[PDB]
Design a protein around this ligand. Structure first.
Ligand SMILES: *P(=O)(O)OC[C@H]1O[C@@H](n2cnc3c(N)ncnc32)[C@H](O)[C@@H]1O
Length: 562
DNA sequence: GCTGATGCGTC
DNA sequence: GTCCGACGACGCATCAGC
DNA sequence: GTCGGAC
């Protein structure tokens, strides 16, 4: 194998040459120099071949390391680890410079310059093996061995080789060249293949010959693909960006992005960046937080499947999602049995997705898709979504295919525009409530502002806001206020709360109530509230226990804000 | 059993 | 307009010391 | 995820 015959110092030399290079091309040139040399050596050495550039690549692009588990080490633990071995003074200057560095690599390089041995004898593979050892020992929760392995690494290397090793352990090289540049240099199809593998060794083994190339590249089973993303659409321009044809509107979830590979009783789960969570959601119907519950959800004719969706936390008590059990909400299928669905239209994918399994509420579901045409519908969807305490809405082309790691390209996400100023902090009082349509708690609150006192007494309603119970602090707030709600009588209202056209279902006297910090996009004129204005896209950012009920912002503050 | 420190991967 | 590299929040995990 | 700089 090649990695056994190549000194780590040469790699470090290349990395140094790349780092100190000013322009995009020189960097590319030095890399090319190294890579070409490596390939030549490979050709010479091997004359069945599993060997490839991977042992180098994984060091060159350590952020793409997958096979090796986490090191369990960052700058501080490394400083703590290093200071012990060299036996530096505990309180000494060097140790102090290490300890608080705020470029840890460089600072560590200058400290080890006089201390380190003349120079290192280790190859790339040895380094790989020792790093493997560290990761493994970390996974096994034994530090005593980690110390040993790292010590072996330190003893056999030059200062420069370790500044690089450190930067490989931190998994940031700071070369000044993007990974796609590296990939473009290595092979023309490298990026394309990495996007549907997220396996550096796969990429390095398959594409080894720069002249040769792959035929059909696409989603595989048990191979992590970089999920398709959504660009931010801009406001009014939407109608033109959807092709003017019919389009899907669906809800914008805050879960985590998770894709599920299934064969029979065997399962694999991958995250956004291609990390394997299978230990969590489980590899089999007998283990994990998810798979056991969803195993019988699938239809009998389903053998092999690939799904992409948003993993959510579902409260069985309240029948809602909390930003208690793990729930997998699935918006796409890239594979079913012997058929690869990746190239089929979104419509077809939804059509198939509906048929592969039966929803289990709170365990596994299908995202709701609202077919739409007109901008007004999008607007309505946004404004309605915010009262559910969503973050926005999603809009998609029914005819668009799945394009891994492509932001935009048929997927759009709409959020409201929020100012970075005080329009994101308005501390205002809950003076009212409405009941949800289940719906056994307050769905929305009615919120108000006060007038400048010589406590206050009279309040003027400002805006409604969706109170739906999606975080604990909302339910707790709900519970705390139960005893204090009173039925609102339109013919005989309370004098403490002055209301416009909009009247609540129940009120609460301000002294028993709570201040909420509400962000909003902006203040607009309204005939429905006493202030004569309301909040566009209001949401509750925080509940305030640091503020008493009398601390509510006045009409003067609001007038100042508008 | 508790708690602050430190790592890891996410949106 | 595009790429892309610093940012910060969160939840969750261990674990040393009390 | 968002931001803001270099092209
Ligand atoms: P916001 O910009 O905070 O979130 C956007 C990302 O959320 C994920 N996502 C949520 N809901 C969906 C749906 N329905 N389809 C696809 N992706 C979804 C994506 O990762 C967004 O980029």
């Amino acid at each position: 194998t090649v990695a056994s015959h190549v000194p780590f110092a040469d790699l470090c030399s290349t990395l140094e040459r790349i780092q100190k290079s000013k322009g995009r091309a020189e960097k590319i040139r030095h890399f090319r120099e190294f890579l070409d040399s490596w390939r030549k050596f490979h050709d010479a050495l091997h004359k069945d071949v599993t060997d490839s550039f991977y042992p180098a690549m994984r060091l060159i692009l350590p952020q793409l390391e997958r096979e090796r588990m986490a090191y369990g080490i960052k700058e501080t633990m490394l400083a703590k680890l290093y200071i012990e071995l060299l036996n530096l003074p505990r309180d000494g200057k060097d140790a102090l410079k290490l300890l608080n560095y705020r470029d840890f690599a460089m600072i560590a390089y200058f400290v080890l310059k006089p201390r380190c041995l003349q120079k290192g004898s280790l190859t790339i593979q040895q380094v790989n093996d020792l790093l493997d050892s560290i990761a493994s020992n970390n996974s096994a929760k034994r530090k005593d061995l980690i110390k040993k392995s790292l010590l072996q690494l330190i003893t056999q290397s030059s200062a420069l080789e370790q500044k690089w090793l450190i930067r490989m352990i931190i998994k940031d090289l700071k070369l000044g060249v993007s990974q796609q540049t590296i990939f473009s240099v290595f092979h023309n199809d490298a990026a394309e293949l990495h996007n549907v593998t997220t396996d550096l060794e796969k990429v390095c083994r398959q594409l080894h010959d720069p002249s040769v190339g792959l035929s059909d590249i696409s989603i595989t089973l048990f191979s992590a693909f970089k999920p398709m993303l959504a660009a931010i659409a801009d406001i009014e321009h939407i109608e033109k960006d959807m092709k003017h044809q019919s389009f899907y509107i669906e809800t914008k979830l805050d879960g985590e992005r998770m894709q599920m590979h299934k064969d029979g009783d065997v399962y694999k789960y991958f995250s956004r960046n291609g990390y394997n969570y299978t230990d969590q959601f489980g590899a089999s119907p007998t283990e994990g937080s998810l798979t056991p519950f969803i195993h019988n959800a699938f239809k009998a004719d389903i053998q092999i499947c690939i799904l992409d969706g948003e993993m959510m936390a579902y409260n069985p008590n309240t029948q809602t999602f909390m930003q208690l059990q793990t729930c997998y909400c699935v918006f796409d299928v890239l594979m079913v049995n012997n058929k690869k669905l990746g190239h089929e239209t979104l419509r077809k994918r939804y059509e198939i997705l509906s048929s592969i399994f039966t929803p289990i509420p709170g365990r596994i579901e299908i995202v709701q898709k609202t077919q739409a045409h007109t901008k007004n519908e999008v607007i309505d969807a946004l404004n309605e979504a915010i009262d559910k305490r969503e973050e926005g809405i999603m809009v998609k082309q029914p005819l668009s295919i799945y394009k891994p790691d492509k932001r935009g390209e048929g997927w759009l996400k709409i959020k409201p525009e929020y100012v970075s100023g005080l329009m994101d902090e308005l501390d205002i009082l809950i003076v009212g409530g409405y009941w949800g349509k289940r719906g056994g708690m307050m769905s929305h609150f009615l919120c108000a502002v006060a007038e400048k006192p010589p406590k206050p007494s009279v309040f003027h309603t400002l805006s409604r806001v969706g109170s739906g119970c999606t975080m604990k602090e909302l339910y707790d707030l709900g519970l705390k206020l139960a005893k204090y709600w009173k039925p609102f009588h339109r013919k005989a209202p309370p004098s403490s709360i002055l209301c416009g056209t909009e009247k609540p279902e129940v009120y609460i006297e301000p002294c028993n109530s709570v201040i909420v910090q509400i962000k909003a996009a902006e203040i607009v004129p309204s005939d429905m509230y006493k202030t004569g204005c309301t909040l566009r896209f209001p949401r509750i950012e925080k509940i305030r226990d640091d503020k008493e009920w009398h601390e509510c912002m006045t009409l003067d503050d609001l007038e100042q804000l508008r």
